[PDB]
């Protein structure tokens, strides 16, 4: 199949529509834009029957009704949309979609939307059946270092100027949330018809609505970005993420840090990273952490995390969030927490 990027989706649809489009990714904005572009171009090329059909395991499975039957009124080409689950299809859904792709009209267009699918769902019979004709487009959130270029491109799309301070402010405020970023760019365009966005305007026209995942918090702690770490913890508190997920995501990397610091005094880091199965993007990260924090801070952090987990699963307390902030302070940065936040 064709694997494609959101920028080149316009060219791919322009050269010719394929049997089915699999638009996948974690962000809402790029998925929505790609789906809108596909729908508009299909309507230009003669697709009028548009169906939105959620896949989620429930009492909703009758998509076959819309494909086996030719349209009596007009020879109107149809478009079917599927909203994959938050974790992808299961085995039953895998085989059901395999049956769905077992028969498809040439005039029927298939749209599937969902999060990224690992190899477990990639090697399923449904995807392998789709592997010939369908075009899959990946839409992923640019990283915090990649956001400014994307914001500059979006500003050029709307004929806007932001200099650099406004770009940094927008990236910080709407980090990991491209939907709100595009909506805010539209809002700024509406606010000032001049289009010359500057700090004394974007400062008050912006929100704090941000999105995050525990990996961002763990990496912020590893680099020692104190303000970013506390910002992520506050945003996750507002979002209502499960504290246990944060606990486990930190615990994995903290156990890795403890073991690597234990082994550092005898073995070079090049062999240790290979033996411990560390990702290539994190090596330098780990290096910095190992060269920054001694085993005393690591043991204090382990004691703190142990107290946090025990008070979470035994006393049913609500002091978890402040305690994780204390751990953030005690991790790479300034270790004080004297008994106060050290058990």
């Amino acid at each position: 199949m064709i694997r494609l990027y959101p920028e080149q989706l316009r060219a791919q649809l322009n050269e010719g529509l394929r049997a089915a489009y699999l638009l996948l990714g974690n962000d809402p904005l790029l998925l929505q834009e790609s789906q809108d572009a596909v729908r508009q171009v299909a309507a230009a090329q003669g697709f009028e029957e548009h169906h939105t059909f959620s896949i989620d395991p429930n009492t909703d499975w009758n998509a076959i009704f819309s494909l086996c039957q030719a349209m009596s009124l007009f020879a109107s080409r149809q478009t079917l949309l599927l909203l994959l689950p938050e974790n992808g299809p299961n085995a039953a859904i895998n085989e059901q979609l395999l049956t769905l792709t077992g028969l498809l009209h040439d005039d029927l267009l298939l749209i599937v939307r969902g999060n990224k699918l690992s190899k477990a769902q990639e090697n399923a019979a449904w995807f392998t059946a789709l592997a010939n004709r369908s075009v899959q487009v990946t839409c992923q959130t640019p990283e915090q270092a990649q956001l400014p270029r994307w914001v500059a491109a979006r500003a050029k799309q709307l004929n806007l100027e932001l200099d650099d301070a406004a770009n940094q402010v927008l990236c910080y405020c709407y980090e990991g949330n491209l939907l709100a970023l595009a909506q805010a760019l539209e809002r700024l365009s509406l606010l000032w018809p001049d289009g010359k966005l500057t700090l004394p305007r974007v400062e008050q026209a912006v929100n704090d609505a941000a999105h995050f995942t525990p990996f961002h918090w763990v990496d912020a702690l590893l680099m020692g970005k104190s303000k970013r770490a506390l910002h992520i913890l506050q945003q996750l508190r507002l979002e209502g993420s499960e504290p246990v997920i944060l606990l486990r995501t930190l615990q994995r990397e903290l156990l890795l840090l403890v073991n690597l610091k234990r082994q550092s005094a005898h073995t070079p880091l090049r062999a240790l990273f290979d033996k411990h199965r560390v990702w290539q993007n994190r090596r330098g990260m780990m290096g910095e952490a190992l060269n920054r924090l001694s085993q005393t801070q690591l043991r204090q952090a382990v004691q703190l995390l142990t107290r946090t987990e025990l008070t979470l699963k035994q006393d049913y307390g609500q002091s978890v969030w402040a305690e994780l902030e204390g751990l953030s302070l005690l991790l790479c940065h300034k270790p004080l927490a004297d008994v106060f936040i050290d058990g």
Binding site: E49, H50, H51, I64, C68, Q69, A70, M71, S72, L73
Partner: protein
């Protein structure tokens, strides 16, 4: 407060209440919308029931002492009390304070009310065309095409019926993206051509309010509403802004093959084959051979149904598919002696008509198995 005196018979009141309290039910959009507007004026009574898209007004004559007034009453409660009184009982209704007292000789009921001022009086308008048709004609028009309307289609203009008045005759069209039902009937007078879409609830109400009698039905169709009069019932409804697609091009322009069969025989053969059809999507396959029709139905647990019937046929050979529900519905609604089928190929539409009449036509698509 308003006096609004009532002194009526039960029989003169049961029928209009049953007619006007039809669609009212469940929880309405507004509390007033769930109440009948009872308005007594001059020597007549108006009962108004609305759903923010239609409005049925029933007129009841008064001969007993009465005083003018207007108030809104719960509909289900009033209908149940009217139907629950003994035969021939006199009903007296008096609005006291902010409650309504309904009295019969040995019973007194109190009911909550709402002011008639707050009732959403539907906007008036001017009809762009008049119309007069005997009731039986409208009955046949609705019965021929109501069943084929789209249920809740996304297009939100197939969920209705197309009234096309042209020259002298009237036509009703319905579709669901896979079926088409068209019925043409004469009226006796030349009329201006008009294309109008009536929502499904309007069609249902028009079907219900026919009364099956003999008095003529009056119709006034405006720019965005329709109104119908039968006896003392006046029903108004809004219209759908969409443009109903041309039904004329749907029908097979060149029907290659003709066949004829017994309506009841074919209907029961289809019904019998329908049991062993797949529930995921029910359909059968027609094998049309020399004076022969074979019905084959399959079900994924390896269930097979076979039927052979002797039909009149003019053609070489045909293999086609059909969603058994659609053909069952069209044959059931045909209600004729013999059915004529027009076939072209396995990938084009199929026409269904009466073997001896042409007023009603149906078009259906094969389903690919």
């Amino acid at each position: 407060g308003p006096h609004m005196k009532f002194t009526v018979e039960r029989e003169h009141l049961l029928k209009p209440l049953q007619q006007v309290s039809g669609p009212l039910g469940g929880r309405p959009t507004l509390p007033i919308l769930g109440n009948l507007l009872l308005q007594v004026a001059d020597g007549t009574l108006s009962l108004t029931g609305t759903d923010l898209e239609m409005e049925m007004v029933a007129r009841v004559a008064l001969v007993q002492p009465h005083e003018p007034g207007a108030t809104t009453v719960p509909a289900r409660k009033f209908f149940d009390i009217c139907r629950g009184l003994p035969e021939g009982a006199e009903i007296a209704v008096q609005l006291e304070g902010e409650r309504m007292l309904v009295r019969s000789g040995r019973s007194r009921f109190s009911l909550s009310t709402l002011p008639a001022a707050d009732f959403p009086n539907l906007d008036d308008w001017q009809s762009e065309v008049e119309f007069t048709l005997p009731q039986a004609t409208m009955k046949r028009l609705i019965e021929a095409t109501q069943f084929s309307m789209a249920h809740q289609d996304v297009r939100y203009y197939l969920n209705g019926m197309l009234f096309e008045t042209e020259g002298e005759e009237l036509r009703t069209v319905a579709t669901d993206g896979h079926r088409l039902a068209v019925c043409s009937m004469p009226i006796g007078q030349s009329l201006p051509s008009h294309s109008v879409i009536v929502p499904r609830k309007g069609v249902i109400e028009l079907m219900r309010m026919l009364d099956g009698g003999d008095n003529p039905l009056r119709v006034q169709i405006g720019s965005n509403n329709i109104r119908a009069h039968v006896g003392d019932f006046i029903f108004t409804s809004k219209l759908v802004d969409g443009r109903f697609p041309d039904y004329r091009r749907v029908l097979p322009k060149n029907p290659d093959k003709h066949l004829e069969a017994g309506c009841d025989l074919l209907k029961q053969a289809f019904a019998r084959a329908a049991i062993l059809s797949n529930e995921k999507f029910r359909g059968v396959r027609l094998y049309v051979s020399e004076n022969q029709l074979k019905i084959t139905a399959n079900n994924p647990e390896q269930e097979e149904a076979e039927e052979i019937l002797d039909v009149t046929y003019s053609g070489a050979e045909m293999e086609i598919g059909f969603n058994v529900s659609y053909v069952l519905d069209v044959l059931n609604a045909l209600k004729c002696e013999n059915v004529r089928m027009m076939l072209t190929d396995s990938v084009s539409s199929v026409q269904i008509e009466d073997a001896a009449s042409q007023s009603a036509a149906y078009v259906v698509m094969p389903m690919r198995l």
